[PDB]
């Protein structure tokens with residue numbers, strides 16, 4: 566019935582209900598490093614997450630989201646290719662069933678184990694609902710994850726997963742600091758795109774960090790034990806919740822470094 570990542574309702578079927586899937590600025594895309602244009606007029610990114618307020622973690626089928634209180638300018642994103650202030654509303658991951666796949670964006674065709682999306686909306690629009698009606702409504706910060714050493718800042722997330730194993734389940738998740746998930750460098754690529762899951766609205770400025778973070782094998786293993794299904798229903802492991810790379814069409818990927 567509803568969309569999913571299975572053979573019968575996966576990405577290749579999304580176009581039947583969501584015509585925009587075959588639009589002009591769809592995401593994710595493949596980042597060809599030898600073609601990205603170094604743009605010196607790009608300002609440095611300004612991430613202010615010191616006053617962030619996490620509230621809850623939930624399994625909504627598809628993936629698990631950590632939600633923040635965005636009633637005020639608490640955790641914001643400015644600078645880079647952005648014009649205005651963007652508020653953090655939530656973060657989630659996309660991962661695979663094996664370590665060699667899981668990320669949505671690819672670099673020179675290279676797939677990573679997973680990808681973290683920190684979702685923000687443009688404050689000049691009032692609420693997120695109005696923001697998704699504008700070409701510059703959202704800004705998503707994407708971070709790649711590779712299997713290596715453990716990431717301390719991620720463990721608090723890994724520990725609570727058991728309590729939200731099935732669809733619709735949530736758990737209180739306060740006092741989490743998203744700063745613990747950032748790589749050392751803030752160098753990035755950027756291009757105009759869209760949400761990667763239905764309704765696939767093209768209202769996103771994508772900012773993809775060049776430097777990936779490392780997460781241990783055991784940390785990623787716990788992501789893989791979640792369920793797409795709700796309590797009582799037959800078990801379907803939540804793995805490979807990622808959309809394949811889409812054609813770039815008439816867009817240019819700019820780089821803040823060289």
Ligand SMILES: NS(=O)(=O)c1ccc(C(=O)NCc2ccccc2)cc1
Nearest residue numbers: 682684697705759760761762764766
């Ligand atoms: N993977 S990703 O960062 O691109 C992404 C970010 C946000 C959303 C979202 O808010 N969805 C709900 C929703 C419901 C109705 C209209 C718009 C969005 C979905 C995907």
Ligand SMILES: [Hg+2]
Nearest residue numbers: 697698699768
């Ligand atoms: Hg829009």
Ligand SMILES: [Zn+2]
Nearest residue numbers: 657659682761
């Ligand atoms: Zn996402």
